[PDB]
Structures are given as C-alpha cells and as structure tokens.
Amino acid sequence: EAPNQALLRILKETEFKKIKVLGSGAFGTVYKGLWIPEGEKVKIPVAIKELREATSPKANKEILDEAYVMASVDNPHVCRLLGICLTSTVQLIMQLMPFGCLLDYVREHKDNIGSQYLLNWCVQIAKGMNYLEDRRLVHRDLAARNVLVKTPQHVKITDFGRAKVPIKWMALESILHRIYTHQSDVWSYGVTVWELMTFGSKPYDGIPASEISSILEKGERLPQPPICTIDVYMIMVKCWMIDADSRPKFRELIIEFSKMARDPQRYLVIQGDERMHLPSPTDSNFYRADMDDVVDADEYLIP
C-alpha cells in the first residue's frame, strides 16, 4: 500500500571499467570493476552483472525485475543495487563483495573459522532476513551461496530473482503446496546455518531431489554437525518443524545467536579455536590485496 519511493540511478557506461570475471553461470557474467563518477575524485569498487547470451526482450525484462527489488532495499546486511547501465543488454552495478560467497569462503578457510565468526554470521543473516520481513519481502532462495562476504566480519544477503527450484533448502509447504512465507525463509535459514556449521557440506549429499519430500515427511532432518552443541542444533531443528508458526521468528534468531556470540566456545566446539585468525583491516596490506582515492559504496553518497 505504501508508495515505493526508491531511487533508480542510471549510470553512464563511460564511468565504469570491467577489470576481470568474478563468476559465470546461468545468471550470466559478474565482473569486478571500478566506478569513477563524473568528477567526484572517488573510485568505487563494484560488481557488474551482464547476461551471457542474446539481447532478447525477455532477458531485459528479467534483469529489470531484479533491479527493481535490489533498488528497493537499504540495510547493512542486505545487498543493494548501486545503479543500472542502459547498454543494449542492460547491466546491474552492485557493491564489490571482495571475499565472494560465504559457502566458498567456509570451504576454503575452514582451518581458520572460529566459533565467534560462525555465530556472528548467523546474527547478521538473521538481521538481514528480519529486515526483509519488515519490508514484507519473502526471499525464497536463502542459502550460504547467496550470502556474500564484504569482509570476514561483515556479510550481506543477495539474490532477489525470486523475492516477492532449490528443493534441499525449501520448507515442507514450499515443496508440496508452493506456499512461500517468512516462515518458509526460516527453514532455509536453518539449512544455511547447517551449511556454515559443517564448513560448506552439501545438504542430503547423494540423495536425489525427488526423494527429499518423502524423507522430510518421514521426519528425517539434516544431522547434528560435530561442532554443534545441542543448543545450536535445537535452533536448527526448530527451523525445520512441520508447523510454520512453531518455527522461530528472525527477531528471536537475532536474540538467540547474539546471546551465544557473547560466549561462543560454550556453543560451538572447534579444535584450536582461539589460535584461529582471518583477514581484518588490522592486517598489513588488507586493502592492498590505481589504489588512490578508492572508497567503499557503503561510505559513498549514502541513501
């Protein structure tokens, strides 16, 4: 009912340069880039999305619905659209998340991921999701692959191509009745937590997608990760109840994981936890790994 007064920024092709390919899939190609506005003495590191095949009117429509959703959000734990460039194909300008997706991040850096990071990431994902809930936006595709890493200490939720099939992250009402709610996103959040807690394991590995519905109906759920106390596992289990209303709310998940983040070694048991470290601005050459006048999108022309 409330008018959507979000601003759609049209950016000139000449103002940004593609540096390298970051990812390539069904979505098309994502490039690492630099955005150098008009004459503002700033360089903004950006991620540029462009579709791999054709210049079809159907492709342009799909990318513009994604732009509408990404331009309508504003939260530290959600990815916002910076702007669009109206080339023949039309491309999305987004914030560069230098450390990639959280799924690949936990797989590649498992030996240095301590309980503090895991629990803080759970808080951040719940904050983003609670924001999406307050904006009445149902994600429908929450997974560790869709959580991006700005810094190891700061993650954001992305992928709004489904926001208003990934069966192994879907709630029961979603598979059987196509019912999607903020409570069906809670189930997905449970699987995302499981992914993190197992340092990037594949949920129901080897089991075909058509067998998931039957498995869930029998009462089978993902197993207790070896680092998880019954406290952390019980939360995951509550996200996977049949009754959507019995599942935790995102605001409760923020509270529960925050309490745990205060004494993380009491809730996750990780061998050599205290001797583990990940990059932070404290690191020599943290930003180093044209570097003059560069500023992050979060500090530039704030909405």
Ligand SMILES: Cc1nc2cnc(Nc3ccnc(OCC(C)(C)S(C)(=O)=O)n3)cc2n1C(C)C
């Ligand atoms: C490997 C990698 N490095 C990245 C650095 N920065 C971003 N920036 C952003 C910001 C918001 N949204 C996204 O992309 C999410 C996708 C892939 C779902 S998209 C481009 O289709 O919207 N990337 C994305 C990056 N990736 C992708 C392709 C997962």
